[PDB]
Amino acid sequence: VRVAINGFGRIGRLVMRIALSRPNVEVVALNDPFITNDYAAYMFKYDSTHGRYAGEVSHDDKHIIVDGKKIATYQERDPANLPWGSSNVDIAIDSTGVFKELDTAQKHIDAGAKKVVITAPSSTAPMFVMGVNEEKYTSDLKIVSNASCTTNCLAPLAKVINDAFGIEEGLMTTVHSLTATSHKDWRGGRTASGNIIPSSTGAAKAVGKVLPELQGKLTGMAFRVPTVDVSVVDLTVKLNKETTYDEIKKVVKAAAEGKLKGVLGYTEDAVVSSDFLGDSHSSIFDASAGIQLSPKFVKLVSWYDNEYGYSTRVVDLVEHVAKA
Ligand SMILES: *[C@H](CC(=O)Nc1ccc(C#C)cc1)C(=O)OC
After folding, report:
1. How many CB atoms lie within 10 A of CB 180?
2. Same domain, 11 and 133
3. Which of 62, 216, 299, 303 sits most deeply, having the most CB atoms within 10 A of its CB?
4. What is the CATH number of the domain that holds 275?
5. Are both 180 and 271 inside the same structural domain?
6. The cross-link Glycyl lysine isopeptide (Lys-Gly) (interchain with G-Cter in ubiquitin): at which residues?
7. Are residues 300 and 312 in the same domain?
């Protein structure tokens, strides 16, 4: 599966790191009009949180070079201008956040790619979350979205809980770090470094798009904090069926070891956020942190590396869309 990456922000770069090590994915090309190849190599090699790339990174006038692999680089502001047809590109991965709708991501198909995966929520492209609704993908869909990192954390857990106990209603808080991506959000323009900063989040509503049965049943908000790029979801749900916390743990652990293996993780250890840097799960259930007040009222806690697990999911979706 031959892929090209549009945009070399943090997501674009971690997607590259993961796709390079994927045996059946070949990174063919990178486009980003705002950087030179020397800067691209620098940004790819070094990462404050996920370590130096464990391999040799260099560049020449036309490539980024990684452990012998030449990745052709381009600087096109209009993705339609890109030689995806000539380069035999199967899937274009758009990590810019600006070509995220059906009519704008179309530019990659227009350029010769067979399909597009958008690493951002879309209003028009169908959204898929691995372990949640990837079975609903059909090969005629040429442009898809991987939703958001927070939705990828919430949705697998909400599905497991809803399938086993039924979610009547849930309110969510995310304690959210300074991750990838101020006159529309006044709080967000204040200094990060010493502040807890409340914020809106559409993750709890966007779960309704990938789990229609939870449409309108979840909402929430975020407190943003100046920590490493691992965040945590705090989901307070009202359940339809009575249960015990022990039963919740067994169901989550069972899903984590079985059908959601690799997507939903499970720990009982005394973890803190930095313990999940570089974790490739979308959602790691913190069994010891949750708390049950009564048989149908529980608080569930789940961690996610807001760059790395999501980027692993992007590559997962690329392979799933290509296998179909
Ligand atoms: C996951 C990374 C992420 O959480 N970005 C993010 C989300 C909300 C806010 C605010 C306010 C800032 C940054 C991701 O990018 O999903 C694709």
Report:
1. 18
2. yes
3. 303
4. 3.30.360.10
5. yes
6. 45, 62
7. no
Residues 6+ apart with CB under 8 A from 290: 245, 248, 298, 299, 300, 301
Residue with the smallest CA separation from ligand 1 atom 12 is: 181
Instruction: Judge if 143 and 128 occupy the same domain.
Output: yes
Residues 234 and 115 in one domain: no
Same domain, 267 and 156: yes
| Contact 199 CB / ligand 1 (< 6 Å) | yes
- CA 20 to chain centroid, in Å, comes to 18
List, comma-separated, the residues after which the chain is broken, a break being a C to N distance over 2.5 A; otherwise answer none: 181
Per the entry, the structure determination technique was X-ray
Q: Are residues 176 and 260 in the same domain?
A: yes
- State the distance from the centre of ligand 1 to the C-alpha of 60, rounded, in angstroms: 33
48 contacts: CB under 8 Å, gap ≥ 6: none
Q: Is 227 annotated as a binding residue?
A: no
Residue in the block written with tokens 């039924």? 166
The residue to mutate among 144, 145, 176, 207, having the most atoms of ligand 1 within 8 angstroms of its beta carbon, is: 176
Of 100, 50, 132, 133, the C-alpha closest to 308 is 50
For ligand 1, mutation pick of 129, 306, 315 (most atoms within 8 Å of CB):
306
DSSP label of 127: B
At how many Å resolution was this determined?
2.0
Residues 6+ apart with CB under 8 A from 155: 129, 132, 147, 207, 210, 211
d(CA 71, CA 92) in angstroms, rounded, equals 14
Q: In the chain, how many domains are there? A: 2
Name residue 274's beta-bridge partners.
none
Where in the sequence numbering do the catalytic residues fall? 149
DSSP secondary structure code for residue 188 in this structure: G
Cα separation, 314 vs 319, whole angstroms:
9
3-state secondary structure (DSSP) of residue 273: helix
Nearest ligand 1 atom to the CA of 121 is 17
Query: Same domain for 152 and 5?
Result: no
Local structure of 40: helix, strand or coil: helix
The answer to whether the beta carbons of residues 161 and 178 sit under 8 Å apart is: no
